[PDB]
Amino acid sequence: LAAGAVILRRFAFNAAEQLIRDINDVASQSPFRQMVTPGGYTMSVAMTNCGHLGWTTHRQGYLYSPIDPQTNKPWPAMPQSFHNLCQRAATAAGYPDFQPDACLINRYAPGAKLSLHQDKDEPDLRAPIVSVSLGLPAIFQFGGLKRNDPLKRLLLEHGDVVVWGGESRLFYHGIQPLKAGFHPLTIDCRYNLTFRQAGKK
Ligand SMILES: Cc1cn([C@H]2C[C@H](O)[C@@H](CO[P-](=O)(=O)O[C@H]3C[C@H](n4cnc5c(N)[n+](C)cnc54)O[C@@H]3CO[P-](=O)(=O)O)O2)c(=O)[nH]c1=O
Numbered sequence: 531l532a533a534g535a536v537i538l539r540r541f542a543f544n545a546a547e548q549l550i551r552d553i554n555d556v557a558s559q560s561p562f563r564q565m566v567t568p569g570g571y572t573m574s575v576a577m578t579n580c581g582h583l584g585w586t587t588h589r590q591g592y593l594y595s596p597i598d599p600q601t602n603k604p605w606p607a608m609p610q611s612f613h614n615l616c617q618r619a620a621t622a623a624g625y626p627d628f629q630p631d632a633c634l635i636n637r638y639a640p641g642a643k644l645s646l647h648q649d650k651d652e653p654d655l656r657a658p659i660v661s662v663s664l665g666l667p668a669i670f671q672f673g674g675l676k677r678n679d680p681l682k683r684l685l686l687e688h689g690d691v692v693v694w695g696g697e698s699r700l701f702y703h704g705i706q707p708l709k710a711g712f713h714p715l716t717i718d719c720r721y722n723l724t725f726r727q728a729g730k731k
């Protein structure tokens with residue numbers, strides 16, 4: 531029950547093996563790292579980016595940068611497999627004009643979590659975010675526009691795609707501590723890809 535959200539279960543199941551290979555290729559150029567929040571805390575989720583712009587912490591805040599601050603080189607180009615999956619998902623959900631220029635890649639080891647937050651660094655909050663889940667299952671939690679709104683929970687499994695549009699694009703959301711387990715393609719972790727329109731164009 532999330533206004534504006536389109537859940538496409540197992541939409542990415544047939545693409546997962548290529549997606550994971552391309553994650554590894556991206557990570558060999560811009561490695562996974564645990565960023566430090568403006569509050570001074572080290573995140574348990576490891577992240578990297580591909581595309582023209584990448585989400586990062588920097589100067590005690592959040593922003594999109596064309597340079598990876600850990601490598602001092604541009605983020606790797608967005609793989610074609612990523613772009614094609616995102617476009618197919620966005621078109622199926624009713625957002626044919628969506629043109630992402632950034633993809634944040636999250637890696638969750640057992641016990642890793644992501645506390646409640648909103649995604650508000652993008653210039654046009656009318657553009658959706660496309661989320662792709664790979665590997666171990668996670669409990670996704672989301673509330674509302676206010677931090678105190680009631681929480682709902684949704685299990686996200688390998689291959690699930692969610693297009694967060696309309697009101698749901700602005701919900702507070704997070705991930706609960708990942709349960710340990712085995713997945714044949716990721717072994718012991720979960721990956722999440724979130725495609726964003728980050729450029730002011
Ligand atoms: C309070 C406490 C914590 N910890 C540990 C435990 C915790 O996991 C770790 C920090 O990791 P995090 O889960 O809180 O990550 C934060 C950053 C993340 N976030 C925000 N904006 C975005 C965004 N646009 N995108 C794309 C992605 N992620 C985003 O959401 C979180 C809240 O953000 P903000 O605080 O509101 O700035 O610190 C302690 O040990 N002791 C303590 O007392």
Ligand SMILES: O=C(O)CCC(=O)C(=O)O
Nearest residue numbers: 636649661703705722724
């Ligand atoms: O892992 C997920 O499914 C959500 C990730 C997320 O909300 C973010 O990185 O902004």
Ligand SMILES: [Fe+3]
Nearest residue numbers: 647648649703
């Ligand atoms: Fe988020």
